[PDB]
């Protein structure tokens, strides 16, 4: 679950929080849908809605985010896309 951030428009504190949150999510949840759901909900609570999370080993995306609320990073071989929009 070593973290490597590829792209972010996010404060440093939220970047660290995202990695730690996703890291715990992967420790706790086995299925990507549930990993994504956990992560999404934690941000809605702390950082207001509306957050969206994609978790997986094989995907591409093209999305629109609110400024300062985007991160894309890997934990090992698993990519996590986390952003706010709406």
């Amino acid at each position: 679950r070593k973290a490597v951030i590829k792209n972010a428009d996010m404060s440093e504190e939220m970047q660290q929080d995202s990695v730690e949150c996703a890291t715990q999510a992967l420790e706790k949840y086995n299925i990507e849908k549930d990993i994504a759901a956990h992560i999404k909900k934690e941000f809605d609570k702390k950082y207001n809605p509306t957050w969206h999370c994609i978790v997986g080993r094989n995907f591409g995306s093209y999305v629109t985010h609110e400024t300062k609320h985007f991160i894309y990073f890997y934990l090992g071989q698993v990519a996590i896309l986390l952003f706010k929009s709406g």
């Binding site: 299925i31 990507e32 849908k33 549930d34 994504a36 759901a37 809605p49 509306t50």
Partner: protein, 44 residues
């Protein structure tokens, strides 16, 4: 309320089934196998 509704969805793709297989060019009649009736002789 402008945000009259906020519908949440979960999405999960299926898994990919893979197997380990042996092959070898030089060898016995059975090339590779996955990791006693003998009715096979009777026709001859």
């Amino acid at each position: 309320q402008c945000n009259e509704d906020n519908v949440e969805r979960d999405i999960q793709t299926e898994e990919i089934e893979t197997r380990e297989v042996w092959t070898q060019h030089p060898g016995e009649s059975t090339v590779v196998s996955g990791g006693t009736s003998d009715a096979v002789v009777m026709p001859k």
